[PDB]
Amino acid sequence: ENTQMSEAYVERSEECSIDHAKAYKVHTGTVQAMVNITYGSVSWRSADV
Amino acid sequence: SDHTTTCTDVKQCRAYLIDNKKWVYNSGRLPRGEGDTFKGKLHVPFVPVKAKC
Numbered sequence A: 001e002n003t004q005m006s007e008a009y010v011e012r013s014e015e016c017s018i019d020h021a022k023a024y025k026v027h028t029g030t031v032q033a034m035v036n037i038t039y040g041s042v043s044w045r046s047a048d049v
Numbered sequence B: 001s002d003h004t005t006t007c008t009d010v011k012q013c014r015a016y017l018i019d020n021k022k023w024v025y026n027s028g029r030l031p032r033g034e035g036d037t038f039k040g041k042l043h044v045p046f047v048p049v050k051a052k053c
Helices: none
Strands: A034-037 A045-048
Touching: none
Parallel strands: none
Antiparallel strands: A034 A045
């Protein structure tokens, strides 16, 4: 004539802040590049476009 | 203190012990206490860290 309770419960692990699978949804976005420009008698100048 | 019990045999009476000066981590292999047991926290020493192997 006795009773043992013994409940259980699932929670996030402590290593979930260092490796996890992020789940993203992708739409169309911007396109960038980088160019190297020289013309005539000047040196190469580069910029992000 | 004391309380000499007026019964005969030692096999027909259970005994317990209430120590509350210190506190223990709530294991799954220990019996739960009486009422509201508080949520007081201890830090975990060796946490994961991202290093170079």
